[PDB]
Amino acid sequence: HMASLKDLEGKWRLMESHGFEEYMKELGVGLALRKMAAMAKPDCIITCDGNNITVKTESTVKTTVFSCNLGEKFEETTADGRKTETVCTFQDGALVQHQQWDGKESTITRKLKDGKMIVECVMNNATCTRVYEKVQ
Amino acid sequence: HMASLKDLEGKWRLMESHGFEEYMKELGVGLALRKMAAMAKPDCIITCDGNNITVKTESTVKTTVFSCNLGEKFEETTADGRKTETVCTFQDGALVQHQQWDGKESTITRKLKDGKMIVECVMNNATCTRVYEKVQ
Ligand SMILES: CCCCCCCCCCCCCCCCCCCC(=O)OC(CO)CO
Ligand SMILES: CCCCCCCCCCCCCCCCCCCC(=O)OC(CO)CO
Ligand SMILES: [Cl-]
Ligand SMILES: [Cl-]
């Protein structure tokens, strides 16, 4: 019943979002791009080649890809344009993506619950939950 | 008539190879994996989201992906398992991928000639040319 990293592999579509505006505010995202991101309703394509993890976020506005090895720190350029130092780990059934930039930090965790991918984003007191389902 | 980075985008299949064994020897690849790599005849899928470049090498034996921003150094784990510091640049119609590890260096350049992707690999006195064509 506990997920593995491979369970996250696939093409996922955003079905539900809560607290995303508030989270993007904490990250520093301005109004215009916030509204653009809120209307964007993307896919998230995840591939897991062993512990080589690739996460592709695809929308009609912008597409982002990072590809990493689990537990090895890497430089990420985020969709909002932050340059972070990021490490992905796998903890209690969740992919945990920790970003640090300018002495700030945020965590994005992705986990399978009840066949859906639950993506929880935290920065300071701001939390966002996004629900994805698998494209058939 | 001179190529741009976007011309490299697509799904490419290996059609011709010369000097690949000799190049893999210079890299340190042992006999077994050399023969495995020589029979592998992969695809190379390249995406170019502005200057965010993703190169996915796909085979039935192993699949590798790196995703980088042009001109920003990054840590690559190569298909043969080297941990390098790599920088991709765009020079005279070619994507140039420079790898350094342990005071060693190698360059892989990818360019469109006559509608095919020519991939030239150099390390020391060892050179390899691989020819890819676009999958329809
Ligand atoms: C949502 C962004 C799409 C592109 C928006 C258009 C322009 C750029 C503005 C981006 C707004 C800031 C995004 C940074 C937050 C990333 C985490 C999002 C979590 C998520 O569902 O994504 C997925 C994969 O990241 C988790 O599975
Ligand atoms: C060829 C390797 C496929 C996997 C082989 C199976 C197991 C791992 C052994 C790999 C042998 C060493 C490969 C390192 C050399 C990479 C450059 C290859 C150039 C090429 O055509 O690739 C493409 C994309 O890299 C250029 O477009
Ligand atoms: Cl990036
Ligand atoms: Cl890598």
Residues B92 and B113: their CA atoms lie apart, in Å, by 12
Q: Which residues of A are less than 8 Å from B63 in CB distance?
A: 49
Alpha carbons B17 and A22: distance in angstroms, whole number: 53
Q: Which residue of A has its CA nearest to B65?
A: A67
| HSE-CB for B102 with a 13 A CA cutoff | 4
Task: Count how many Cα atoms sit within 13 Å of the Cα of residue A14 in the half-sphere of its side chain.
Answer: 19
Is residue A27 a contact partner of residue A122, using CB atoms and an 8 Å limit? Answer: no
Please give the Cα distance from A62 to B46 (Å, whole number). 17
Q: Yes or no: say if B23 and B113 are a contact pair by the CB < 8 Å rule.
A: no
Written as six digits, the tokens of B50 are 């502005």
Q: Which ligand is nearest to the CA of A66?
A: 3
Contact A90, A110 (CB under 8 A): no
Experimental approach was X-ray
Shortest CA distance from B72: residue in chain A? A75
Find out whether A12 and A135 touch, Cβ atoms under 8 Å: yes
Q: What is the DSSP string of chain B?
A: ----GGGG-EEEEEEEEESHHHHHHHHT--HHHHHHHHS---EEEEEEETTEEEEEEE-SS-EEEEEEETT--EEEE-TT--EEEEEEEEETTEEEEEEEETTEEEEEEEEEETTEEEEEEEETTEEEEEEEEE--
Phi and psi at A30, nearest 5°, equal -65, 165
User: Which CATH homologous superfamily contains domain A1-136?
Assistant: Calycin beta-barrel core domain (2.40.128.20)
CB atoms within 10 A of CB B12: 23
The 3-state DSSP class for residue A120 equals: strand
Q: Which of A45, A68, A67 is nearest to A132 (CA)?
A: A45
CB contact under 8 A, B77 and A69: yes
Question: Token digits for B105?
Answer: 């260096």
Is B48 labelled as part of a ligand binding site? no
**Tokens 């696939």 found at:** A10
Whether A131 lines ligand 1, by a CB cut-off of 6 Å, is no
Q: Is the distance from the beta carbon of residue B82 to the nearest atom of ligand 2 less than 6 Å?
A: no
Q: Tokens standing for A18? A: 């809560």
Helix axes A31-38 and A20-27, enclosed angle (nearest 10): 140
B70 contacts in chain A (CB < 8 Å): none
Report resolution (Å) to 1 decimal: 2.0
B125 to chain A nearest CA, in Å? 31
Query: What is the C-alpha separation between A119 and A43, in angstroms, rounded?
Result: 13
Give the three-class secondary structure for A64.
strand
CA distances to B7, B20, B56, B77, B115 from B36, rounded to whole Å, are 30, 12, 18, 18, 28
